[PDB]
Design a protein around this nucleic acid. Structure first.
Ligand SMILES: Nc1ccn([C@H]2CC[C@@H](COP(=O)(O)OP(=O)(O)OP(=O)(O)O)O2)c(=O)n1
Ligand SMILES: [Mg+2]
Ligand SMILES: [Mg+2]
Ligand code: NA
Length: 340
DNA sequence: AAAAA
DNA sequence: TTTTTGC
DNA sequence: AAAAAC
C-alpha cells in the first residue's frame, strides 16, 4: 500500500503510535512559524501529519522506507529519537528563550505572532509582568484573553462541548426554528478535548437578511443573559462568522460556578452546507491537503463555499461531504479519520 | 524542508 | 535546478 | 491601521 503525501488520501484516527516523533516535529514546525520560515514549517507539519496516520510505531529507520513527506532533515530527527528516545533539535527549541516566550504569549487570546514578538523585544518574559505594566495598551480581545486566561488555557472537554451545543441550539432556534446547528471542528472529528467549540449554522427557509441578522440576534440574547464575555462578528472563508467567549454555568455540564469557553459560530447559505461542513470539520492539515490535491491532481478549486472544475469551467454541486469526495476522485474519509 | 515542474 | 507549499 | 480572530 503506497502511502499518499496528501492527508485527504490517508485515514488519520486519534490513536497515534508515533507521538514521540510527532511531538518533536510539532515543536520544530512551531519554531519555524515563529522564525517566519513558512516552507520549513509546512514540511515539518506534513511529516508530523503522515506519521500520525501510521497504523504502527516507527521502531527502526527501515520502517520509514516508502513513507512520503520524510526528507533527509526529517529522517535525521527520526534517527535521533530512535537512538535515545529524545530529539536534540526539539530539546534546543524547548530551551530557546524566543520560543518559550512566543508559546507563553500567544497562549493569550488576542495575542499573535506580531504582538508576541513586540513584547519579547520589549524585554517581557512573563504574563504577570505584561498584565501589571502601566504603559502597555491592550486591545479588547487581549483584555478578555487575560481576564479568562486560566479557563481558556485549560481546554474544553466533551461534557462542556455538549453543554455549549445545547446553549447554541437553544439560542439559534429562538430566532430561526428550522435552523440546523452542527458542531464542527475537533469535536466532530471525535476529539475528547479542544481549545474551542465550533458550530456551523444553516437554515433551509431563511432569507438573505434573516441569515445576516441571526448571529447579531443570538449574541444580543446572550449579552442580555450576561453570558457574552467577548464577541467579534465578521460580516459576510467569506461567510459571516463570530469569535466568542461564553459563560458556561457548571449546572449545565453533566469555585466561581462557571467556565469561560471559546466558541466560534459560522453561518452559511443552505445550498453550500456540504462545502462549509467539510471546510469547518478540519483538521487544518486535512483541509490544506484537500485543496492542494484538488488543485494539483484534479485541476479543481475547493473552498468552504464551492468546488470548481478549471478544465470544464463549471461549478460542481454537492448535497453531502460524500459527493464532494466523489467529485474529487477520493475515497470517503469519515470525520473521525480526518485528524491529520 | 519536501516534492513537483 | 526552480517553483510550490490552502491562491 | 494593524492586528487578531487562523
Ligand atoms: N488554519 C486553519 C484553522 C481552522 N481551519 C478549519 C478546519 C478546522 C476547523 C476548526 O478550527 P480550529 O478550532 O482552529 O480547529 P480545531 O480542529 O477545532 O482544534 P481545536 O479542537 O484545538 O479547537 O476550521 C482550517 O481549515 N485552517
Ligand atoms: Mg475548534
Ligand atoms: Mg475554531
Ligand atoms: Na493566541
Amino acid at each position: 500500500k503506497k502511502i499518499s503525501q496528501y492527508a485527504c488520501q490517508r485515514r488519520t484516527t486519534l490513536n497515534n503510535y508515533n507521538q514521540l516523533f510527532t511531538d518533536a516535529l510539532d515543536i520544530l514546525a512551531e519554531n519555524d512559524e515563529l522564525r517566519e520560515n513558512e516552507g520549513s514549517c509546512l514540511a515539518f507539519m506534513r511529516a508530523s501529519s503522515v506519521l500520525k496516520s501510521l497504523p504502527f510505531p516507527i521502531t527502526s529507520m527501515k520502517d520509514t522506507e516508502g513513507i512520503p513527506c520524510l526528507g533527509d532533515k526529517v529522517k535525521s530527527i527520526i534517527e535521533g529519537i530512535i537512538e535515545d528516545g529524545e530529539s536534540s533539535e526539539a530539546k534546543a527549541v524547548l530551551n530557546d528563550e524566543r520560543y518559550k516566550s512566543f508559546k507563553l504569549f500567544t497562549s493569550v487570546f488576542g495575542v499573535g505572532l506580531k504582538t508576541a514578538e513586540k513584547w519579547f523585544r520589549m524585554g517581557f518574559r512573563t504574563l504577570s509582568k505584561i498584565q501589571s505594566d502601566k504603559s502597555l495598551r491592550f486591545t479588547q480581545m487581549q483584555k478578555a484573553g487575560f481576564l479568562y486566561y486560566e479557563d481558556l488555557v485549560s481546554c474544553v472537554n466533551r461534557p462542556e462541548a455538549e453543554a455549549v451545543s445545547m446553549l447554541v441550539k437553544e439560542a439559534v432556534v429562538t430566532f430561526l426554528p428550522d435552523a440546523l446547528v452542527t458542531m464542527t471542528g475537533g469535536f466532530r472529528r471525535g476529539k475528547m478535548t479542544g481549545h474551542d467549540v465550533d458550530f456551523l449554522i444553516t437554515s433551509p427557509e431563511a432569507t438573505e437578511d434573516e441569515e445576516q441578522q441571526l448571529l447579531h440576534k443570538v449574541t444580543d440574547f446572550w449579552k442580555q443573559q450576561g453570558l457574552l464575555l467577548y464577541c467579534d462578528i465578521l460580516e459576510s472563508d467569506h461567510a459571516q462568522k463570530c469569535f466568542l467567549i461564553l459563560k458556561l454555568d457548571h449546572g449545565r455540564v453533566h469555585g466561581k460556578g462557571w467556565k469561560a469557553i471559546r466558541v466560534d459560530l459560522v453561518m452559511c447559505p443552505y445550498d453550500r452546507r456540504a462545502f462549509a461542513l467539510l471546510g469547518w470539520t478540519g483538521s487544518r492539515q486535512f483541509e490544506r491537503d484537500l485543496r492542494r490535491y484538488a488543485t494539483h491532481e484534479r485541476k479543481m478549486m475547493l473552498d468552504n463555499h464551492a468546488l470548481y472544475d478549471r478544465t470544464k469551467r463549471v461549478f460542481l454541486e454537492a448535497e453531502s461531504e460524500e459527493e464532494i469526495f466523489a467529485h474529487l476522485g477520493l475515497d470517503y474519509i469519515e470525520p473521525w479519520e480526518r485528524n491529520a
